[PDB]
Amino acid sequence: MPYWNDLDGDSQVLNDTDDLVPQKINAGQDKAVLILRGNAWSSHDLAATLSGSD
Amino acid sequence: MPYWNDLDGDSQVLNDTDDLVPQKINAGQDKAVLILRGNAWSSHDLAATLSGSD
């Protein structure tokens, strides 16, 4: 995702025998990450019926 | 801009066989300054149309 940084700078000495100069603007970047996970588990059977509960 | 400083001084020993002396007042000065400033900025164009906003 992008962004626009705000302006800054001096004013100037407003004066003759010379002219002004305009100025500019910049831009910028931003990132992120996707991640993903999972697991599992299991059992036997014979044990289940022999143990008295599930 | 000007100003008038306030009076000060001794009284006297009021007595015969002697006399008094009038006294005076002063004045004073003050200044200031004018200042002036400015600046400018600008952009391109095709960047504007190609970037998706202004």
PDB file of C-alpha atoms in Angstrom:
ATOM      1  CA  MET A   1       0.000   0.000   0.000  1.00  0.00           C
ATOM      2  CA  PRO A   2       1.253   3.490  -0.862  1.00  0.00           C
ATOM      3  CA  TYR A   3       1.265   6.875   0.840  1.00  0.00           C
ATOM      4  CA  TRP A   4       2.067  10.543   0.198  1.00  0.00           C
ATOM      5  CA  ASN A   5       4.426  12.244   2.620  1.00  0.00           C
ATOM      6  CA  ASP A   6       3.577  15.816   3.525  1.00  0.00           C
ATOM      7  CA  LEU A   7       5.355  18.912   2.270  1.00  0.00           C
ATOM      8  CA  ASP A   8       7.999  20.917   4.100  1.00  0.00           C
ATOM      9  CA  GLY A   9      10.554  23.601   3.404  1.00  0.00           C
ATOM     10  CA  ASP A  10      11.645  27.187   3.814  1.00  0.00           C
ATOM     11  CA  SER A  11       9.559  30.166   2.798  1.00  0.00           C
ATOM     12  CA  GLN A  12      12.002  32.463   1.090  1.00  0.00           C
ATOM     13  CA  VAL A  13      13.499  35.893   0.931  1.00  0.00           C
ATOM     14  CA  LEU A  14      10.963  37.565  -1.282  1.00  0.00           C
ATOM     15  CA  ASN A  15      13.158  39.751  -3.342  1.00  0.00           C
ATOM     16  CA  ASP A  16      13.794  41.376  -6.670  1.00  0.00           C
ATOM     17  CA  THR A  17      16.681  40.784  -9.083  1.00  0.00           C
ATOM     18  CA  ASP A  18      15.788  37.110  -8.836  1.00  0.00           C
ATOM     19  CA  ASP A  19      12.829  34.774  -9.087  1.00  0.00           C
ATOM     20  CA  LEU A  20      11.366  31.972  -6.995  1.00  0.00           C
ATOM     21  CA  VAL A  21      11.554  28.235  -7.361  1.00  0.00           C
ATOM     22  CA  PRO A  22       8.608  25.865  -6.981  1.00  0.00           C
ATOM     23  CA  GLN A  23       9.111  22.552  -5.133  1.00  0.00           C
ATOM     24  CA  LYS A  24       7.913  18.946  -5.149  1.00  0.00           C
ATOM     25  CA  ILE A  25       6.198  16.007  -3.413  1.00  0.00           C
ATOM     26  CA  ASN A  26       7.271  12.406  -2.779  1.00  0.00           C
ATOM     27  CA  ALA A  27       5.635   9.009  -2.320  1.00  0.00           C
ATOM     28  CA  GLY A  28       6.250   5.868  -0.305  1.00  0.00           C
ATOM     29  CA  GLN A  29       5.673   2.153   0.021  1.00  0.00           C
ATOM     30  CA  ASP A  30       4.311  -0.318   2.557  1.00  0.00           C
ATOM     31  CA  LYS A  31       4.064  -4.122   2.659  1.00  0.00           C
ATOM     32  CA  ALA A  32       2.540  -6.944   4.705  1.00  0.00           C
ATOM     33  CA  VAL A  33       2.654 -10.756   4.905  1.00  0.00           C
ATOM     34  CA  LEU A  34       0.225 -13.647   4.636  1.00  0.00           C
ATOM     35  CA  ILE A  35       0.888 -16.732   6.759  1.00  0.00           C
ATOM     36  CA  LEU A  36      -0.929 -20.022   7.223  1.00  0.00           C
ATOM     37  CA  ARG A  37      -0.768 -22.989   9.600  1.00  0.00           C
ATOM     38  CA  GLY A  38      -2.495 -26.156  10.757  1.00  0.00           C
ATOM     39  CA  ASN A  39      -2.017 -29.538  12.395  1.00  0.00           C
ATOM     40  CA  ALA A  40      -3.791 -32.809  13.121  1.00  0.00           C
ATOM     41  CA  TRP A  41      -4.172 -35.692  15.536  1.00  0.00           C
ATOM     42  CA  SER A  42      -5.633 -39.170  15.795  1.00  0.00           C
ATOM     43  CA  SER A  43      -6.046 -42.293  17.904  1.00  0.00           C
ATOM     44  CA  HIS A  44      -6.415 -46.058  17.857  1.00  0.00           C
ATOM     45  CA  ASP A  45      -9.690 -47.878  18.237  1.00  0.00           C
ATOM     46  CA  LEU A  46      -9.188 -51.071  20.192  1.00  0.00           C
ATOM     47  CA  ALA A  47      -7.883 -48.836  22.936  1.00  0.00           C
ATOM     48  CA  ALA A  48     -11.047 -46.758  22.839  1.00  0.00           C
ATOM     49  CA  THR A  49     -13.348 -49.711  23.356  1.00  0.00           C
ATOM     50  CA  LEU A  50     -11.107 -51.275  25.964  1.00  0.00           C
ATOM     51  CA  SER A  51     -10.573 -48.119  28.041  1.00  0.00           C
ATOM     52  CA  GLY A  52     -14.154 -47.371  29.060  1.00  0.00           C
ATOM     53  CA  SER A  53     -14.570 -44.003  27.330  1.00  0.00           C
ATOM     54  CA  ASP A  54     -13.849 -42.280  24.038  1.00  0.00           C
TER      55      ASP A  54
ATOM     56  CA  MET B   1       8.347  55.658  17.955  1.00  0.00           C
ATOM     57  CA  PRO B   2       9.362  58.110  20.685  1.00  0.00           C
ATOM     58  CA  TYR B   3       8.877  58.364  24.435  1.00  0.00           C
ATOM     59  CA  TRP B   4       9.406  60.738  27.365  1.00  0.00           C
ATOM     60  CA  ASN B   5      11.319  59.402  30.346  1.00  0.00           C
ATOM     61  CA  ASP B   6      10.053  60.479  33.742  1.00  0.00           C
ATOM     62  CA  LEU B   7      11.669  63.043  36.008  1.00  0.00           C
ATOM     63  CA  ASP B   8      13.899  62.358  38.994  1.00  0.00           C
ATOM     64  CA  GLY B   9      16.260  64.193  41.290  1.00  0.00           C
ATOM     65  CA  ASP B  10      16.966  65.608  44.715  1.00  0.00           C
ATOM     66  CA  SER B  11      14.741  68.095  46.480  1.00  0.00           C
ATOM     67  CA  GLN B  12      16.994  70.652  48.088  1.00  0.00           C
ATOM     68  CA  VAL B  13      17.786  72.173  51.437  1.00  0.00           C
ATOM     69  CA  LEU B  14      15.389  75.072  51.472  1.00  0.00           C
ATOM     70  CA  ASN B  15      17.274  77.927  53.026  1.00  0.00           C
ATOM     71  CA  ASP B  16      18.197  81.563  52.770  1.00  0.00           C
ATOM     72  CA  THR B  17      21.675  82.733  51.717  1.00  0.00           C
ATOM     73  CA  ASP B  18      21.407  80.532  48.618  1.00  0.00           C
ATOM     74  CA  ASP B  19      19.016  79.822  45.772  1.00  0.00           C
ATOM     75  CA  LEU B  20      17.450  77.048  43.714  1.00  0.00           C
ATOM     76  CA  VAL B  21      17.997  75.496  40.277  1.00  0.00           C
ATOM     77  CA  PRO B  22      15.269  74.371  37.800  1.00  0.00           C
ATOM     78  CA  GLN B  23      15.868  71.075  35.950  1.00  0.00           C
ATOM     79  CA  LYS B  24      15.013  69.318  32.690  1.00  0.00           C
ATOM     80  CA  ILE B  25      13.394  66.417  30.804  1.00  0.00           C
ATOM     81  CA  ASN B  26      14.714  63.992  28.179  1.00  0.00           C
ATOM     82  CA  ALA B  27      13.355  61.952  25.277  1.00  0.00           C
ATOM     83  CA  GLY B  28      14.030  58.594  23.672  1.00  0.00           C
ATOM     84  CA  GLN B  29      13.763  56.458  20.575  1.00  0.00           C
ATOM     85  CA  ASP B  30      12.361  53.088  19.536  1.00  0.00           C
ATOM     86  CA  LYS B  31      12.452  51.081  16.295  1.00  0.00           C
ATOM     87  CA  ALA B  32      10.977  47.964  14.689  1.00  0.00           C
ATOM     88  CA  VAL B  33      11.417  45.851  11.539  1.00  0.00           C
ATOM     89  CA  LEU B  34       9.307  44.734   8.600  1.00  0.00           C
ATOM     90  CA  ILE B  35      10.010  41.311   7.103  1.00  0.00           C
ATOM     91  CA  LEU B  36       8.463  39.330   4.272  1.00  0.00           C
ATOM     92  CA  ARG B  37       8.632  35.772   2.935  1.00  0.00           C
ATOM     93  CA  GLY B  38       7.085  33.253   0.564  1.00  0.00           C
ATOM     94  CA  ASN B  39       7.687  30.105  -1.453  1.00  0.00           C
ATOM     95  CA  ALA B  40       6.150  27.907  -4.133  1.00  0.00           C
ATOM     96  CA  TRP B  41       5.770  24.385  -5.454  1.00  0.00           C
ATOM     97  CA  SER B  42       4.614  22.469  -8.502  1.00  0.00           C
ATOM     98  CA  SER B  43       4.258  19.089 -10.184  1.00  0.00           C
ATOM     99  CA  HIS B  44       4.243  17.236 -13.482  1.00  0.00           C
ATOM    100  CA  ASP B  45       1.126  16.147 -15.293  1.00  0.00           C
ATOM    101  CA  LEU B  46       1.399  12.777 -16.951  1.00  0.00           C
ATOM    102  CA  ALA B  47       2.483  11.530 -13.532  1.00  0.00           C
ATOM    103  CA  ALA B  48      -0.826  12.821 -12.224  1.00  0.00           C
ATOM    104  CA  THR B  49      -2.890  10.991 -14.806  1.00  0.00           C
ATOM    105  CA  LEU B  50      -0.816   7.844 -14.547  1.00  0.00           C
ATOM    106  CA  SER B  51      -0.806   7.634 -10.736  1.00  0.00           C
ATOM    107  CA  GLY B  52      -4.530   7.312 -10.071  1.00  0.00           C
ATOM    108  CA  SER B  53      -5.059  10.530  -8.102  1.00  0.00           C
ATOM    109  CA  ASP B  54      -4.140  14.201  -8.167  1.00  0.00           C
TER     110      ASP B  54
END
